[PDB]
C-alpha cells in the first residue's frame, strides 16, 4: 500500500505557509503560470492529488487537456514492407534511405 | 550533437532480423501490442523516431493521441479557501477534511 | 514474509479512488486499453495479483495467452557439432557463416 | 544501432573454448540447465541470437513455447463492481476480503 | 541477527499460493526442471533453505551431487616461471604465446 | 565479439609487474590465498582464463574440485503435503512449524 502524495499550488505567500507546515506547496501568481506547474507534477508522477487555489485553476478541464499535450514524443513513421530490408545487405543503410525518403531527413544515426 | 536513436516495431520474426542487424527492433503481433511498446519507449525516453510496420500503426495520429493522453491523472482539485487553512493550527488535518468533504473519498495523508 | 504486491485495473475515476486510498490503481476505458495496460505492467515483474474490472476483461484466460505470446525472443539456433568451430583459427567468422547458412540473416558480430 | 550479441550454450569444455575465442559461451550438462540458461539470457535481455548444441535441445518448438510461458504468472482476477470499494472507508480491508472470497486465498497486503 | 531466507519449489498452482501468502514460491512440473531451479537459486546465492515438494525431488542426494557440477569455471593454467615474462618487453604478447603454447588457443586480449 | 578476460595469480611483486604492463595481476603469498582469489574470480564470473604460478597451486585438480564442490549450500528439504499449508489459514506459520518439524531447528523466518 502506497504513500499518497499531494501537491498544493497557491499564491507564493500561501505556499510558503504550506511549506512551513510540512506540505508540498508551490507558488504561482497567475493561472497560465500555474498550468505549467501542473504539467511538471503529472510529469514527475509522484502525486495522487494537486490542490490548486481556484483563482489559479478556473478551468480544470482545459488544464487537463493541456498537460497531456506537453508530452514530447518521438516522430512515428508508418512503413509499408519493412521485410524488404533483408532483401539486401546494408539494412541500416536501407532504413537511413527509407527514412530520408519519407520525412526528408538525414536523421543522424 | 546528440545521438539519434531510432527504434523499429515489426512482426516478431522481422523484429528479430532487425536486432540481428544491430537495429533496435521490437516485435508485436497486433496494433494494441504496438501501442503498449510505444508507451514503454516513450516512458524510457531517448528515441527521436519509431518506425512501425504500417499494418501495426495504420493511424500515427490516433496512436499519438493515446501517448499524450493515456495518463492516469491525479484528482485535480480547485479549492475555494486555502488561505483559511492557516486559521487553525493543524493544516494537515484541515486539508485532509477539505478533500474528504469535497470528493468524498478520504485521502491518505 | 515478503510483501505481496497487487495492482488494480479499472474505470479511470475508480482507479483515482484506489490511488487516494493508498492502493496501486490504474485507469482504463476499454478492454484494449486494459490489455495494453496489462502488457506494460506484466513485464514490470513486481505484481503478484492483478484485480481487473470484469467489464474490461471478458476473458481472463485468453488475456493470459496474449501476454505470454508478447515476449521478445532471441533467435534460437540449435547446432550440431558446435565444437568443430575450433578446427580452424577463426571461430567468430565460422559462426557468422554458420548463422548465415542456417538462417539467411548475416549477423553483425 | 546497438551491440549485436550472441550467446552459445554448449557442453562445459566447449563453452570454455568459446570464451577463449572471444564469444559468450555458457556451459550446460543437461537439457534442463540449457533451458534455464535460455530463460536467464532472455530475462537479462541483450541477446539477438542464442546458439545451442543440439544435443542439449530436445525440441526447439517446445523450448520457445516454455520461454513464451516463462513470463511467470501474476494471478488475474476479474471483478464485477470495483466501484463499491468506496461505500465504506476500508478500501484495503474490502480488497483483501473480496480477494479471499474469490480466489479462495488470503492475501498479504 | 538476520532472517533466514527460504524458497519453496512446488507445482505452479501451489507456488502461486505461497507467493500470495508472502513467501518465495517457484513453480516446476518435473524432477529435472526442479533441479534446474535449484541450480539457478544456488548460483544466485541468497537462500539458506529450499523446501521442495517431494514429487519434484525424488532423489535429493543426487540433487546436491549435481548442483556442485554446474558451476562454469575459467580455464585454470598453472605456469612455471611467470617472472621470465619481464625479461622481454611485450608481456601481453609473451602471455599470448604462452597460453597458445599450452592449450592451443589464440586468446583475444 | 567480446574482450577475453584473463587473470594472473602470482607472487606479490610479479603480480605488481603484470599490472604495470596492463594485465590483470593478483598477488598471493600462499596456496590458500591463491585459492581464495580463484573463488573470488569464479564468483565475479567474467574470466575465460586464470594463469597461476605453479608454486601456488599444489594440486590443480584439487583446486577445481574445491571450485565446483565447495561453496556453502542451502539445506535441501523434500516435503510431503505443501498443498496442505493453505488449507490451514496461516501458511507462514504452518511453514515455520513444518521445517522445524522436519530438520529440528526453529528457523528464523
Ligand atoms: Ca513538450
Ligand atoms: Ca489509463
Ligand atoms: Ca513483443
Ligand atoms: Ca554451467
From Swiss-Prot, chains A, B, C, D, E, F:
Q: Which Pfam families match?
A: ATP-synt_F
UniProt GO BP: proton motive force-driven plasma membrane ATP synthesis
What InterPro entries does this protein map onto? ATPase_V1-cplx_f_g_su (IPR008218), ATPase_V1-cplx_fsu_bac/arc (IPR022944), ATPase_V1_fsu_sf (IPR036906)
Molecular function per GO: ATP binding; proton-transporting ATP synthase activity, rotational mechanism; proton-transporting ATPase activity, rotational mechanism
Q: Does the keyword Transport apply?
A: yes
Provide the alphabetized UniProt keywords: ATP synthesis, Hydrogen ion transport, Ion transport, Transport
Regarding protein family, the annotation reads: Belongs to the V-ATPase F subunit family.
Job description of the protein: Produces ATP from ADP in the presence of a proton gradient across the membrane.
Question: What name does UniProt use for this protein?
Answer: V-type ATP synthase subunit F
Give the originating organism. Thermus thermophilus (strain ATCC 27634 / DSM 579 / HB8)
Amino acid at each position: 500500500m502506497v504513500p499518497v502524495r499531494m501537491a498544493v499550488i497557491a499564491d507564493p505567500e500561501t505556499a510558503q505557509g504550506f511549506r512551513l507546515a510540512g506540505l508540498e506547496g508551490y507558488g504561482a501568481s497567475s493561472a497560465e503560470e500555474a498550468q505549467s506547474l501542473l504539467e511538471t507534477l503529472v510529469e514527475r508522477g509522484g502525486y495522487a492529488l494537486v490542490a490548486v487555489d481556484e483563482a489559479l485553476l478556473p478551468d480544470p478541464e482545459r488544464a487537463v487537456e493541456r498537460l497531456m499535450r506537453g508530452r514530447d514524443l518521438p516522430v512515428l513513421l508508418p512503413i509499408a514492407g519493412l521485410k524488404e530490408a533483408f532483401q539486401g545487405h546494408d539494412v541500416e543503410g536501407y532504413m537511413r534511405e527509407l527514412v530520408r525518403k519519407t520525412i526528408g531527413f538525414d536523421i543522424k544515426l
